[PDB]
């Protein structure tokens, strides 16, 4: 009934390690008791807990020219439009109208798709570098 | 027949200049240069004397110099005039003209 018992169970099960019990009780307090907790290798001397909120997936950008944050080499926007595609985007006419909605409302656009092929990629990078339209694939 | 910058086409061949390729859309999105494609709208800049369908009579070309026409996708001959690109088509190959 209490997270103190959760910490006690995780401490007893980890050969009396109180720090492991605390770092598991904190994880269960943050992501929920019936939540996803994954043990991973660490490159430091001490353990750490990383809470991933929202929708994070292990896919990078198609083109490195979409970077607008120089400090972390990241691509960051606020209040961005999202265009999702089941199939691969290759043609000019399949990506231009979404760019018209992005440009008319002056909102950033992130296009999550299977892949972005040469014509659409050329359009996106050329619009990003020439006029200043904010867009990432 | 009429000549454009000292070039008179022979028989029913006409010489046209393709229109400028579309670089930007209406809402401001610009297009890559490669994906612009071949422009199918052109302006006739030179006309020939016309092919002789029957002996003793010369049939002139339908189009005239200064007419906006719609070219076919295939059939043109490349002509380099004053370091500029022009295309020689037959009189019958032109799909139609824009009347205004």
UniProtKB/Swiss-Prot annotation, chain A:
The modification N6-succinyllysine is found at residues 29, 40, 43, 56, 74, 88. It is found in: Mitochondrion matrix. It comes from the Eukaryota. The modification N6-acetyllysine is found at residues 29, 40, 43, 56, 74, 87-88, 107, 130. It is linked to Spastic paraplegia 13, autosomal dominant: A form of spastic paraplegia, a neurodegenerative disorder characterized by a slow, gradual, progressive weakness and spasticity of the lower limbs. Rate of progression and the severity of symptoms are quite variable. Initial symptoms may include difficulty with balance, weakness and stiffness in the legs, muscle spasms, and dragging the toes when walking. In some forms of the disorder, bladder symptoms (such as incontinence) may appear, or the weakness and stiffness may spread to other parts of the body. Leukodystrophy, hypomyelinating, 4: A severe autosomal recessive hypomyelinating leukodystrophy. Clinically characterized by infantile-onset rotary nystagmus, progressive spastic paraplegia, neurologic regression, motor impairment, profound intellectual disability. Death usually occurs within the first two decades of life. Chaperonin implicated in mitochondrial protein import and macromolecular assembly. Together with Hsp10, facilitates the correct folding of imported proteins. May also prevent misfolding and promote the refolding and proper assembly of unfolded polypeptides generated under stress conditions in the mitochondrial matrix. The functional units of these chaperonins consist of heptameric rings of the large subunit Hsp60, which function as a back-to-back double ring. Homoheptamer arranged in a ring structure. The functional units of these chaperonins consist of heptameric rings of the large subunit Hsp60, which function as a back-to-back double ring. Interacts with 2 heptameric Hsp10 rings to form the symmetrical football complex. Interacts with HRAS. Interacts with ATAD3A. Interacts with ETFBKMT and EEF1AKMT3. Interacts with MFHAS1. This is 60 kDa heat shock protein, mitochondrial. It comes from Homo sapiens.
From Swiss-Prot, chain B:
This is 10 kDa heat shock protein, mitochondrial. Homoheptamer arranged in a ring structure. 2 heptameric Hsp10 rings interact with a Hsp60 tetradecamer in the structure of a back-to-back double heptameric ring to form the symmetrical football complex. InterPro entries: Chaperonin_GroES, Chaperonin_GroES_sf, Chaprnonin_Cpn10_CS, GroES-like_sf. It comes from Homo sapiens (Human). Pfam families: Cpn10. SUPFAM superfamilies: GroES-like. The modification N6-malonyllysine is found at residues 38, 52, 54. GO terms for molecular function: ATP binding; metal ion binding; protein folding chaperone; protein-folding chaperone binding; RNA binding; unfolded protein binding. GO terms for cellular component: extracellular exosome; membrane; mitochondrial matrix; mitochondrion. Induction: By stress. The modification N6-succinyllysine is found at residues 26, 38, 52, 54, 64, 68, 78, 84. It comes from the Eukaryota. One of its GO terms (biological process) is osteoblast differentiation. The modification Phosphothreonine is found at residue 77.
